[PDB]
Amino acid sequence: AKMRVGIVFGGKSAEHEVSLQSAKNIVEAIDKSRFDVVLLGIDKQGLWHINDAGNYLLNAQDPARIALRPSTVTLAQIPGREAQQLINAESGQPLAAIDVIFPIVHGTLGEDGSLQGMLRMANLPFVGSDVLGSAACMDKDVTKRLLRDAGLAVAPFITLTRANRAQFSFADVEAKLGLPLFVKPANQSVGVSKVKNEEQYHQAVALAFEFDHKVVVEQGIKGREIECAVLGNDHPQASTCGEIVLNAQVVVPAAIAPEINDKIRAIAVQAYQTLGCSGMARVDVFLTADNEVVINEINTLPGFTNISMYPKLWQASGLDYTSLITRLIELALERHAADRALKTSM
Amino acid sequence: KMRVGIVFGGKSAEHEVSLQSAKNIVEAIDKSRFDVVLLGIDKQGLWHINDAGNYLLNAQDPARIALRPSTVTLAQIPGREAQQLINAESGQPLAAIDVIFPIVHGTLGEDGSLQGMLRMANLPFVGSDVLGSAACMDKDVTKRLLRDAGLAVAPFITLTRANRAQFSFADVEAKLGLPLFVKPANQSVGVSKVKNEEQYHQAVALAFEFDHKVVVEQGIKGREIECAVLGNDHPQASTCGEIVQVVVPAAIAPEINDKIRAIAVQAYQTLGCSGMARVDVFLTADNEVVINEINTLPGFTNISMYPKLWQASGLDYTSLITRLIELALERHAADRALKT
Ligand SMILES: Nc1ncnc2c1ncn2[C@@H]1O[C@H](COP(=O)(O)O)[C@@H](O)[C@H]1O
Ligand SMILES: Nc1ncnc2c1ncn2[C@@H]1O[C@H](COP(=O)(O)O)[C@@H](O)[C@H]1O
Ligand SMILES: [Cl-]
Ligand SMILES: [Cl-]
Ligand SMILES: [Cl-]
Ligand SMILES: [Cl-]
Ligand SMILES: [Mg+2]
Ligand SMILES: [Mg+2]
């Protein structure tokens, strides 16, 4: 009766240990009357490690030493299979069946649609946003353009590409955006610099081009840093808002008036729909002194530790952590059923 | 010589077209520079390693061309950067492939899923990356990004499962007028021309069979023109072609040819395409250019518009294939040089 949930975690990013913590907390809290779990760890070189819930961590209690436990099984996926899709690569024998994947692998590949694309090739249902929603939210330039087109507020900006970058001087950028500026790679908070003068500008742009082929240069926004948790597929719902306050403290709920809370929540939901998210996302905004709401980022893989903003916000809104995990799995399976019902030709 | 893995076939109704594309690429590819490895995907979605000497049944018959069945099924070990693909039956790795030329028409092969799998294998590949592929596949996302860029698209609304019943026919006619064209956002199957309410409800139901989003757009009056774009950061446009019959080059003024070409390049840049794309537009009587579609996996057969447009612009098919492979390798080399 139980579904087997494969939790895919870790990854090559600097957020590898956060992902381990997320996986640990999910394993600890998931409803065991409804779900069995299997742990699919990605080490820091990209390789996958399948383990049971009792032998996937090393030094699981101390955070400064927590680490993926190696697997003795190399796993492979057979693209195009509809069942028995995962096999022991060396023996060819199928692994125990996985009904749904819960991916919590931060950064490139894990959060940019590549992992979702591979899971789709293997016909594996999965939690969270699909290929397009993941890829688009990962690219801050594309996200900002879609949000702007929807009439939602974003920080005024210039996106530098390899093709266009030589057309701009610092004088052009300052003329359009003022000072200070924020410079960030479109796809990555690595490479983000605050810029007050020409020398810092050149160093920041050069730096960001070491991490991505596109660089977003933004007007600096004066505002509080508010975050909102969104949950759902076709009928998404927003949590209460939280705030990030320098000690940096996660403040739940944010100390804002209810009308402003609801205004941000409605904008979060609109943003979520504009970007085609599914399952979950965390929307990060700036709240200016005039209560203008400026959207900074839509994160399709929020942190999932017991202390992370996304679960804390749902807890503050009446949805406990165990129930949140169950809902995310139900949403994944609902979306998979809806997709598989679509027709392919006449 | 570089080892070029051609991934072809697949589950779509364009399976046979993909087979013909792969056959035409095998026959034309510069053998002084490339060794071909055939990775055929059968009609059920399983991947195989095929022998160039016998991979096609009825190869000279377009109505019966078929992929010869094979004992090997391929598997991928995610996250590996070498020996990424194995013979699933034997556990043994395939020899390293330097670059993938994917020509799998249909959903997974064009919507970014296949590209995501190849990225997870760190394989260079021809054509657009995950986001460009996924965004160009979704006509709603494409049209919104083009509109945001200041380029012209047909005025439209996008129906979803959630909002589907919020829009009455009267609301739609008031906003967009008649006739309308109704299409699934992601698929030209499911496309209907609508001249009244009875046709509208039938067309919307049809499009919702194929996708969760349905584009309803204003009918455009104009000639149907196509333009082939090639390149990464410095893309170039072929001469234009017209669909009436296929007329290559299109019988339009050179100034208008160049206007459409420059818009096709802008559209390509707006959507973040790489390698190649075919841009389909409407040319109105006032010479306004309304962009209909950006196709990131054009046809590669000998009757296909995309190679024919380049052929009529002085780029031969063999050199086109070589350039596409060079572009894939250039993009991989750029990505590989990034800090991580
Ligand atoms: N346009 C901006 N205006 C003001 N602060 C910004 C802006 N972009 C980034 N920041 C700051 O830089 C941090 C990291 O950038 P990000 O990863 O985009 O959140 C944020 O938490 C802000 O403190
Ligand atoms: N908005 C439109 N205005 C006029 N004709 C259209 C429009 N959308 C689609 N069509 C017609 O329908 C065909 C198939 O649509 P598509 O697959 O979008 O090209 C086109 O080749 C046109 O003949
Ligand atoms: Cl929902
Ligand atoms: Cl979070
Ligand atoms: Cl180029
Ligand atoms: Cl074509
Ligand atoms: Mg932030
Ligand atoms: Mg068309």
Q: Which residues in chain B touch residue A149, judged by CB atoms under 8 angstroms apart?
A: 144-145, 147-148
Resolution for this model in angstroms, one decimal place?
A: 1.9
Cα separations (Å) of A3 from A96, A98, B22, B137? 12, 8, 41, 33
Dist. CA A215–CA A162, nearest whole Å: 9
Residues 6+ apart with CB under 8 A from A268: A228, A230, A238, A283, A285
CB contact under 8 A, B116 and A131: yes
Q: What is the DSSP string of A248-279?
A: -EEESS-S--HHHHHHHHHHHHHHHHHTT--E
Q: Which stretches of A69-196 are assigned E, i.e. beta strand?
A: 75-77, 86-88, 100-105, 157-161, 181-185, 193-195
Dist. CA B279–CA B300, nearest whole Å: 15
Dist. CA A141–CA A185, nearest whole Å: 9
Burial (0-12, 13-18, 19+ Cβ within 10 Å), A244 = middle
Reference B260, options B232, B281, B277; nearest CA is B281
Specify the experimental method.
X-ray
Burial (0-12, 13-18, 19+ Cβ within 10 Å), A258 = exposed
Dist. CA B78–CA B66, nearest whole Å: 30
Cα separations (Å) of A156 from A153, A271, A330? 9, 17, 38
Dist. CA B55–CA A180, nearest whole Å: 61
Distance, in angstroms, between B132 CA and closest chain A CA?
A: 9
Distance, in angstroms, between A91 CA and closest chain B CA?
A: 7
Q: Which residues in chain B touch residue A16, judged by CB atoms under 8 angstroms apart?
A: none
Name the DSSP letter for residue A166.
Answer: G
Dist. CA A222–CA A286, nearest whole Å: 8
Centre of ligand 6 from the C-alpha of residue B239, in Å: 13
Q: Are strands A224-232 and A86-88 parallel, antiparallel or unpaired?
A: unpaired
Centre of ligand 1 from the C-alpha of residue A182, in Å: 7
Bridge partners (DSSP) of residue A3 are: A35
Residues with CB under 5 A from ligand 3 (ion): A 232-235
Please give the angle made by the CA atoms of A20, A21 and A22, to the nearest 5 degrees: 90
Q: Which residue has the tokens 């589907």?
A: B164
For chain B, domains (ranges, CATH) are: 2-125 (3.40.50.20), 155-218 (3.30.1490.20), 221-337 (3.30.470.20)
Reference B340, options A162, A107, A182, A105; nearest CA is A107
Q: How far from each other are the two terminal CA atoms of chain A, in whole angstroms? A: 36
Dist. CA A185–CA A205, nearest whole Å: 9
Dist. CA B309–CA B300, nearest whole Å: 11
Q: Are A233 and A331 in contact (CB under 8 A)?
A: yes
Residues 6+ apart with CB under 8 A from B180: B172, B173, B193, B194, B200, B203, B216, B217, B218, B219
